[PDB]
Design a protein around this ligand. Structure first.
Ligand SMILES: [Ca+2]
Length: 194
């Protein structure tokens, strides 16, 4: 009745692995709740106003990984570096994709995995210092984490919107809100709720 795309997603870098493990299933459940809290809300100008802002945030992160990937993939050409490294422990995650927005978040994690792969060889080829590597890894790890947090924050603003419109009980039976086990993600969601 409803399409669900199931896919095995291998992740090499420890940064992309950690982002995936602490944010994905929460974000996957968050975009699911948003999609149903919206049809319970019903008003289409608001439904197009949340997705356009949902898919903008997903787009801005996607845009900035593309530009980071571009500049660093030609630092390797400037230094004649062809190859990427092996990874001592890549992992494979079985993920299901219920909406296109889940696909784009899962595709963001892949582009982060690639970006870490680029940074890792530029670090290994002595083009980037140890600090430049950890600032890339930390800030890019953090960048998707707050993106996760803000999706969830957007989801919590939709729930309060449903409350004011009387539909509190209707979404407590269609989509109960899940706990956010990551404190960084929960903090960014509560800022995005104000
Ligand atoms: Ca844009």
């Amino acid at each position: 009745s409803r399409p669900v795309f199931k896919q095995v997603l291998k992740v090499n870098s420890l940064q992309a692995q950690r982002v995936m493990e602490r944010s994905f299933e929460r974000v996957s459940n968050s975009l699911f709740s948003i999609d149903v809290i919206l049809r319970i809300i019903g008003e289409q100008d608001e439904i197009d106003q949340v997705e356009t802002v949902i898919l903008e945030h997903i787009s801005k992160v996607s845009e900035d990984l593309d530009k980071a990937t571009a500049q660093l993939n030609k630092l390797m050409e400037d230094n004649g570096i062809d190859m990427m490294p092996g990874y001592t422990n890549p992992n494979e995650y079985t993920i299901e994709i219920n909406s296109p927005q889940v696909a784009q978040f899962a595709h963001l994690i892949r582009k982060l995995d690639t970006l870490m792969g680029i940074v890792d060889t530029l670090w290994l080829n002595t083009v980037l210092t140890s600090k430049q590597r950890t600032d890339a890894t930390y800030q890019w790890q953090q960048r998707l984490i707050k993106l996760a947090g803000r999706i969830i924050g957007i989801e919590k603003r939709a729930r309060i919107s449903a409350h004011s419109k009387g539909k509190e009980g209707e979404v407590a039976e269609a989509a109960p809100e899940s706990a956010t086990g990551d404190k960084e993600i929960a903090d960014e969601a509560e800022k995005t709720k104000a």
